[PDB]
């Protein structure tokens, strides 16, 4: 919409209090003409239409229950593009300031979120497996990292180039959750998942087979179910970016950690340089071997830890 530029107010799923950017006409819009051609944020209605309605509020207080998934879709979409912007240098998903779209209260009792091709979608969860997917900070930098994917690689989503899509998902998402630096960690989804079971989420890339997940190439899914384990072999990359990261010792290979500002480096550096559409694991590897040796050179400790890592989840 044509408006003014305000400030509103309002809660999260979780219950916190966060100032969101909104436009003025008539309404107050979920919409922050802040961040490159805007973020925007819609309400699809217990309905599967998309976008659905541009989200219009009364008085730009966002406190009630209804309210909640949309201030953190709008909140967290504006966090992950001030990490790509401040950490990368990259603006928005197509690294042009591309407008961000995202609807929440998509169908009835949805246990997923999803990037469509076109924006982010949020299920509310059914209460007992999810509460509103917008809640986590991993799930909205997840989501729109496969935006930056789509745009970048463009890794297709089947097999091992698919597996490699998932964990760039993951590897950003979690990126993104430290850099927010609110109740940071290496698994995925925990703050959404089940509201009855404390400390668990959909999965570790620290130890991914704690949810079943390969963290071993010689344990890898080769069916063709979930497109041929796209979330399931992406277990192996998460465990491989973790120990790039944080290091440590793995079926017997030691790995000495990096930290998590260079394990962003060299993966964002493999992913807008060196993977390609059908880029495979080994030719990931490759891509991340490169990525270090432009930025710190071969015989860095960069280098030796990347090849460690890889060596560790059995990826040659
Ligand atoms: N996003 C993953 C994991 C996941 C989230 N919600 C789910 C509900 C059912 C099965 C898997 C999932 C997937 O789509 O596979
Ligand atoms: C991050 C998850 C909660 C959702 C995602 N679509 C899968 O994986
Ligand atoms: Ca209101
Ligand atoms: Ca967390
Ligand atoms: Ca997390
Ligand atoms: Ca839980
Ligand atoms: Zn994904």
Redesign the pocket.
């Given at each position: 919409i044509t408006g003014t530029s305000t400030v509103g107010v309002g809660r999260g799923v979780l219950g916190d209090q966060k100032n969101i950017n909104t436009t003025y006409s008539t309404y107050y819009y979920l919409q922050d003409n802040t961040r490159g051609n805007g973020i925007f944020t819609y309400d699809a209605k217990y309905r599967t239409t998309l976008p659905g309605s541009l989200w219009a509020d009364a008085d730009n207080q966002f406190f009630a229950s209804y309210d909640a998934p949309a201030v953190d879709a709008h909140y967290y979409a504006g966090v992950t593009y001030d990490y790509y912007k401040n950490v990368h240098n990259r603006l928005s998903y197509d690294g042009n300031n591309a407008a961000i779209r995202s609807s929440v209260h998509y169908s009835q009792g949805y246990?997923?979120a999803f990037w469509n091709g076109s924006q982010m979608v949020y299920g509310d969860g059914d209460g007992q497996?999810?509460i509103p997917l917008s809640g986590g900070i991993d799930v909205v930098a997840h989501e729109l990292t496969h935006a930056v994917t789509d745009y970048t690689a463009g890794l297709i989503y089947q097999n091992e180039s698919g597996a490699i899509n998932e964990a760039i998902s993951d590897i950003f998402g979690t990126l993104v959750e430290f850099y927010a630096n609110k109740n940071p960690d290496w698994e995925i989804?925990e703050d959404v998942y089940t509201p009855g079971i404390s400390g668990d989420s959909?999965r570790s890339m620290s130890d991914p087979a704690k949810y079943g997940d390969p963290d071993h190439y010689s344990k890898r899914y080769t069916g063709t179910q979930?497109n041929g384990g796209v979330?399931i072999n992406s277990g192996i990359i998460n465990k491989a970016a973790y120990l790039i990261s944080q290091g440590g010792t793995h079926y017997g290979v030691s790995v000495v950690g990096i930290g998590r500002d260079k394990l962003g480096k060299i993966f964002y550096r493999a992913l807008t340089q060196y993977l390609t559409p059908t880029s495979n694991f080994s030719q990931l590897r490759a891509a991340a071997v490169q990525s270090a040796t432009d930025l710190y050179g071969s015989t860095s400790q960069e280098v030796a830890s990347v090849k460690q890592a890889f060596d560790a989840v059995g990826v040659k």
């Open positions: 246990n997923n497996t999810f989804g959909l979930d979330h």
